[PDB]
Amino acid sequence: DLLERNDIEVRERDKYTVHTLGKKKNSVAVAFVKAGKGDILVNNVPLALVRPEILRTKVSEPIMILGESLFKGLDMNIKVAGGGHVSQIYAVRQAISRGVLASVKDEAARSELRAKLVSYDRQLVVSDPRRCEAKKFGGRGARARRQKSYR
Amino acid sequence: LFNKWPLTDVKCQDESLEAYISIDNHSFVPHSAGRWSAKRFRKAKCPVVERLTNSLMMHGRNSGKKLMAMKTVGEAFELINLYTGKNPVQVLVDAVANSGPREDSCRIVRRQSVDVSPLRRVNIGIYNIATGARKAAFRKVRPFAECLAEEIMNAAAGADKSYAISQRNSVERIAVSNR
Amino acid sequence: NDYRDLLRMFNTNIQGKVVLECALVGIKGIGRRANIDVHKRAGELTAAEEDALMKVLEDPLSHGIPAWMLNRNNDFESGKDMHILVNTIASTHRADLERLRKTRCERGVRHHHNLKVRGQHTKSTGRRG
Amino acid sequence: GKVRTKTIKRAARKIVENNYESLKPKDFQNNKAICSKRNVAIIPSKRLRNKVAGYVTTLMNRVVKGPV
Amino acid sequence: VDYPTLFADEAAMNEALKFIKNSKCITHTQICERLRVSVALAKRVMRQLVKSGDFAIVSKSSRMTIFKNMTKKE
Amino acid sequence: NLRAKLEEAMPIRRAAYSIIRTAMRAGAAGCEVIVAGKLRAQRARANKFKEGCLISTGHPKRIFLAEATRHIKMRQGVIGVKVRIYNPNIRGAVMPDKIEIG
Amino acid sequence: EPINARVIEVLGRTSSRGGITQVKVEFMTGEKRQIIRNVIGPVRKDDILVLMESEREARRLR
Amino acid sequence: QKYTIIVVGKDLKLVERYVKSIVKEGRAFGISGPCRAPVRRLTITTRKSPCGEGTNTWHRFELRMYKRTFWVTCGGNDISTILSKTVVIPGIQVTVEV
Amino acid sequence: SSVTRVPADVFINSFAAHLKNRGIIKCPAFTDYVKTGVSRQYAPRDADWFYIKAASVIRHFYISGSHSIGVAGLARKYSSLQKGKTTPHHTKRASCKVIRSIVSQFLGQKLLIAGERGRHISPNGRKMVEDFAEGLQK
RNA sequence: UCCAUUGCGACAACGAGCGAGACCCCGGCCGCGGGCGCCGCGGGACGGCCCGCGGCAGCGGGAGGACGGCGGGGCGAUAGCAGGUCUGUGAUGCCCUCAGACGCCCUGGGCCGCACGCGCGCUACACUGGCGGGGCCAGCCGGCGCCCGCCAGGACGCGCGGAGCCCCCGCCGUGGCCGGGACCGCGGGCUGGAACGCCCCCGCGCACCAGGAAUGUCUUGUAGGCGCCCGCCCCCACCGCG
């Protein structure tokens, strides 16, 4: 589940033309676009069905920013491995936006979809690294130390 | 918010609080980690509903549980809309605006009355409304959602019954006396 | 909605409002070591179903209840597992303490001196004794 | 919150008083390239080298913009 | 303390339904405070009231069932 | 060499001063000798005799120093000798802060 | 009566803990007198304060 | 016949030259591309103090073990020729396999 | 794809009902008076639990695709934490005998095949999982 | 002025040195190659840029960018403390024993005995919950299969293979209650030469309804909540390090 050759091992043939990624909080996602009928699936599960039911709107933000035309022809297949439930929905959004960017990247029109998406939501395109810190001796956490008995 | 309640005409009515309030930059559902703890006043640019949903995740127990909180303020929001026939976010902006106390007697022994900043009033108003619900959601029958919504409606009116309004008036009380 | 009030099984008071599973949760305190719907509620329960249950509780190994699911499992008198409640738990607990008193054992002395038996730190966590 | 050490300041000032012509006033990267030449100066590490270069681009702006 | 109902509403059930129908909205717990039913009983009778269509569930959640009467408009 | 020289009962200062010379001649810019114990007394003390500048901390210290610890035995008791030799010219590279600027 | 009064400059905080900032307030709603007014809470220039008891001016005299 | 080669080096710099030498000796025998086994981190955390007195400060000691993947299709004598040919640096793990 | 498009929990509940009518599984005697898991101290109140579990084991085997993993792997999927201890709570696996008695029953009915090691969905069974998903689709 | 003997400026000082810093370990980013294994080698960030302010050092905003202005560590001068360790050792002085030994083995007990006081913890006090039927995602990094058994485990072979929280839906309904699981009584296993160890099943149902004077640690992936791994291990973690 951590940065292995898993990125391409899931699909044999059915060559995808556009490759994109979305990775946050150890949850890494690899997104492969075949540009067919525009439908999006993540981990074999259609994007319209997402396990958190409130967090389907977070996943459908790239799609909500641009019109149906952009996603009318872009068929995306996504594969999120590792991290956690919430880090996986956050990862999905980053990968879908890298996929639209990759379709119009050569033209100066890449700028239009980067501005609109980013202005509505930061991290729709970018990925905030915020990695976890390390426990140090004398404490149960990086910022937490055990209660001192005297003084 | 929750595929409903657009902030089309929802707006603040109090000028000072409006400067620190968000009624436009709201992502769908009260989520998104924007690091609004960063820099200094990133709270102003943070969706009020997120600020409210973040307050609920406190007092241990429900610590960090944003999803449960998001669906709880969604249950409260629908209760608010149904009770007042009014967009919940407009009632929310008014509730957290009236609740914030404008006069606090800090130490500055003796104590002296000092004017309260609009950000502090914005943060206390959100905080008091949750605690008004949290306290009334303990060993009681009404769910945390029904108190959070009960508190919000009275706070918009200014009815002392809301814990936030009573604490605001008690804060401004000990402030007037220790001027 | 049909409602019946308090019932008594093995000289216990049973609240009709609670679900049947909760109603039996304690019989004479020492009781809960079936053919009736457990969600029906004690008031909803019929006399007849209770009679079938009365047979089930008196003779557990007759209706598909297992040996492991029994309160007692090897006895000290018959060598056989059985389900005992109400006064019998009290009489057998007395009998089990009396057997521990009979011969001198660590189990016997501790149960009398009120020290925890099989327990460990008596030094810091038995306070208020 | 970044105050340079004496070693960084001293090395950078020799770089400017000698290769002023090679340096350019506003860009750190051109100044970093002059530091990378190695024939002009030996700089151990990448961070140490960048700090000497960064001070040297401020120095370059300052020496054109009045005497230093 | 509170009154455990024992699902005892019979002739009284029809008037209990009458008050619930009159109220603009009902939640499973609101009934339990207003009339001392167990909130479990409140779900029981509410399922019958929605079965007629007197009430409309705005939203169903495992704990909170939000019902506003679709009727009472007339 | 020091531990065995100390055994012949030579002056402890002279022992360190002779060892200090042969490291500086061999090139070490930093030379440090510390002998600690009950020396000429019934009480503990530490006697540092040092010639030159030695780095004492950081990644250069790991590769640019030669700390060697030995435990002399004496009728009074153990008087361990510690010698640390610092070579900036280690030929493995340069000191991280040494800007040649030539 | 509540009065609207914006900050003119955010002066260094006193209060012995640094908690209470010093702010100058001109009643934008009236004669604009820039009386100093002590403020508890995070503040930046141009943040309106609605209170102005007007029976108190701040002390910044050293 | 193809023979498996595994090299384990504690110090990355010492194996770094060995991997460069491995290509420069077995190029004719078609040595496999040097895939690197993920580091095996041997970690021991021990109290720094000989006693337990003072603050409980912990001394962390870590030995990182690096391994590389190699395969050569060559004769039985030819692996021995590369084994002599590769740069010999002390304290290295040498593997000959089938 | 097909069953994957259907919400797995919705498919599991609906298929369990179908398996009971279709005569698949036919729950054993021990399952009425047993609590799944060493962590759970309470028996399931569903009364159709051995059917809902049996949709979970066979559909999870469909998810295996070609894994041929065993009963303990499925038991881990339905595991939860043991409480009732002063010490903190730790995850305990599901009871294997219930899980063994459905995978063996499925293979016995030829809905599953023992290719090697554990079990993978049989081609005869593969139609069943897809068939029900198609019914859910409309 | 910095955070900093960090600098800048002036001076009976003028030059140095060590500590700081630098380096190092990891991370997030972008390439270049390689393959059984994502892991080898490099760049990328420097207060550069913009604007104000200051001789200046720099200060505070902006931008541009994974990353912005002491990460998240390691190493930590000088002079010390009669701080702790002779019970870690073929480190050790002085010393004590040395054949009924203060040597070593063998057996049985003790460190875990409990009127009580305290320190670090763990689980609580419920409905922002217990219940428990499914979905489902980990990282230090990692094995399973088949039957038998309620489990606990076991037989038998082989190389394999992944949490909780949360999510939905039931349910209980403010009742020391369907919260809590402390103690106790039958059993069923396991590890070992042996429980006096642990695990599990049926019981059993203590206080506890939010804690006085005091206090303790913390500012981003942080507090907290939540699981998991290893160490010491025959068994066993409310522990430590992760």
CSV table of C-alpha atoms in Angstrom, one decimal, chain B residues 14-80:
chain,number,residue,atom,x,y,z
B,14,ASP,CA,-23.5,44.0,12.1
B,15,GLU,CA,-20.7,45.9,10.4
B,16,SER,CA,-17.8,45.2,12.8
B,17,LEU,CA,-18.5,41.5,12.9
B,18,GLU,CA,-19.0,41.4,9.1
B,19,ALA,CA,-15.3,42.3,8.6
B,20,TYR,CA,-14.3,39.1,10.4
B,21,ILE,CA,-17.2,36.9,9.0
B,22,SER,CA,-17.4,34.6,6.0
B,23,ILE,CA,-20.8,34.3,4.1
B,24,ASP,CA,-19.4,33.8,0.5
B,25,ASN,CA,-16.2,31.6,0.5
B,26,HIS,CA,-18.0,28.3,1.6
B,27,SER,CA,-16.9,25.0,0.1
B,28,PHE,CA,-19.7,22.4,-0.3
B,29,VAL,CA,-20.2,20.8,3.2
B,30,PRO,CA,-18.4,22.3,6.3
B,31,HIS,CA,-15.1,20.5,5.7
B,32,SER,CA,-11.7,21.3,4.0
B,33,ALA,CA,-8.4,21.7,5.9
B,34,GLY,CA,-7.3,25.3,5.0
B,35,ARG,CA,-4.9,25.7,7.9
B,36,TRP,CA,-7.0,28.6,9.2
B,37,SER,CA,-4.9,28.3,12.4
B,38,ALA,CA,-1.9,29.6,10.3
B,39,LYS,CA,-0.5,33.2,10.2
B,40,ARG,CA,-2.7,35.5,12.3
B,41,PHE,CA,-6.4,36.2,11.4
B,42,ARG,CA,-7.0,33.4,8.9
B,43,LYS,CA,-10.2,32.7,11.0
B,44,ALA,CA,-12.0,35.6,9.0
B,45,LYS,CA,-11.5,33.7,5.7
B,46,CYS,CA,-12.7,30.4,7.2
B,47,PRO,CA,-16.3,29.1,6.5
B,48,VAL,CA,-18.4,30.0,9.6
B,49,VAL,CA,-20.1,26.6,9.3
B,50,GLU,CA,-16.6,24.9,9.5
B,51,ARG,CA,-15.8,27.2,12.5
B,52,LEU,CA,-19.0,26.0,14.2
B,53,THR,CA,-18.4,22.3,13.2
B,54,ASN,CA,-14.9,22.6,14.7
B,55,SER,CA,-16.2,23.9,18.0
B,56,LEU,CA,-18.5,20.8,18.4
B,57,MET,CA,-15.4,18.5,18.2
B,58,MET,CA,-14.3,19.4,21.8
B,59,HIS,CA,-14.5,18.4,25.5
B,60,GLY,CA,-12.8,15.1,24.8
B,61,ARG,CA,-15.2,12.4,23.8
B,62,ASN,CA,-16.1,13.9,20.4
B,63,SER,CA,-12.5,15.0,19.7
B,64,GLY,CA,-11.6,15.3,16.1
B,65,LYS,CA,-14.9,13.8,14.9
B,66,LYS,CA,-15.6,16.4,12.2
B,67,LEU,CA,-17.8,14.0,10.0
B,68,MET,CA,-20.2,13.2,13.0
B,69,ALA,CA,-20.2,17.0,13.7
B,70,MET,CA,-20.8,17.9,10.1
B,71,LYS,CA,-23.9,15.6,9.9
B,72,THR,CA,-25.0,16.9,13.3
B,73,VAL,CA,-24.9,20.6,12.3
B,74,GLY,CA,-26.7,19.4,9.1
B,75,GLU,CA,-29.5,17.8,11.3
B,76,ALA,CA,-29.6,21.0,13.4
B,77,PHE,CA,-29.6,23.2,10.2
B,78,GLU,CA,-32.7,21.3,8.8
B,79,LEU,CA,-34.4,21.7,12.2
B,80,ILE,CA,-33.6,25.5,12.1
